[PDB]
Design a protein around this ligand. Structure first.
Ligand SMILES: Fc1ccc(CNC[C@H]2CCCO2)cc1
Length: 211
């Protein structure tokens, strides 16, 4: 096992093959301990889950400080936080996976290259290298800074994202809200008038597929 695993891939290969809560260490630094939910089953596992939507019990209409730091319940609905995502994606080349499920249908999207800038970039999104079945809805968002109501689409649509003008993805939107662009949307799968029941965003090293 690796004493201070810096993501859910290093934490898995230690043998641990159950999805659940695990401790990771940013830059492998024992002083930068982070609790994450590892999805160890989806496409060979080793994923840090950074968003989960599944029942609308948690409020995602939260401020910049809340999106930077993280919020909610890692076992249920949560946001891991942008400072975390910046530090994780700085450790090497990460891939993004999005898993969607709504009234029994499933779709996914993988981006070979995924990173989040530091606070000085307003946590700039980078997503390149699409494959999957949900449709390339993040390409629209590539290069966008993060937006919350207090730093305008977040206020217009009552959510938070790497907004442009405004979104094809709104996975931190209002739960079960089918009003145009207000819900948990992945436009190129279910459009802007269908709020998705279940959504996870997760990352692991892009080189995991053949490590
Ligand atoms: F994924 C996440 C990441 C962060 C959080 C909020 N952390 C709260 C701090 C202060 C009191 C306890 O920890 C929730 C879910």
């Amino acid at each position: 096992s690796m004493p201070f695993p810096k993501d859910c891939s290093q934490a898995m290969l230690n043998g641990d093959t159950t999805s659940g809560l695990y401790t990771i260490y940013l830059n492998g630094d024992k002083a930068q301990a982070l609790e994450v939910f590892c999805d160890m089953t989806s496409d060979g596992g080793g994923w840090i889950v950074f968003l989960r939507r599944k029942n609308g019990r948690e409020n995602f209409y939260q401020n910049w400080k809340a999106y930077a730091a993280g919020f909610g319940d890692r076992r249920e609905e949560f946001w891991l936080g942008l400072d975390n995502l910046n530090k994780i994606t700085a450790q090497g080349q990460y891939e993004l996976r999005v898993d969607l499920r709504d009234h029994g249908e499933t779709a996914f999207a993988v981006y070979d290259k995924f990173s989040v800038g530091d606070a000085k970039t307003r946590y700039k999104l980078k997503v390149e290298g699409y494959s999957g079945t949900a449709g390339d809805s993040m390409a629209y968002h590539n290069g966008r800074s993060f937006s919350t109501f207090d730093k305008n689409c977040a206020l217009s649509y009552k959510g938070a994202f790497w907004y442009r003008n405004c979104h094809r993805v709104n996975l931190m939107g209002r739960y079960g809200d089918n009003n145009h662009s207000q819900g948990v949307n992945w436009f190129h799968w279910k459009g802007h008038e269908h709020s998705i029941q279940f959504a996870e965003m997760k990352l692991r090293p892009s080189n995991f597929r053949n490590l």
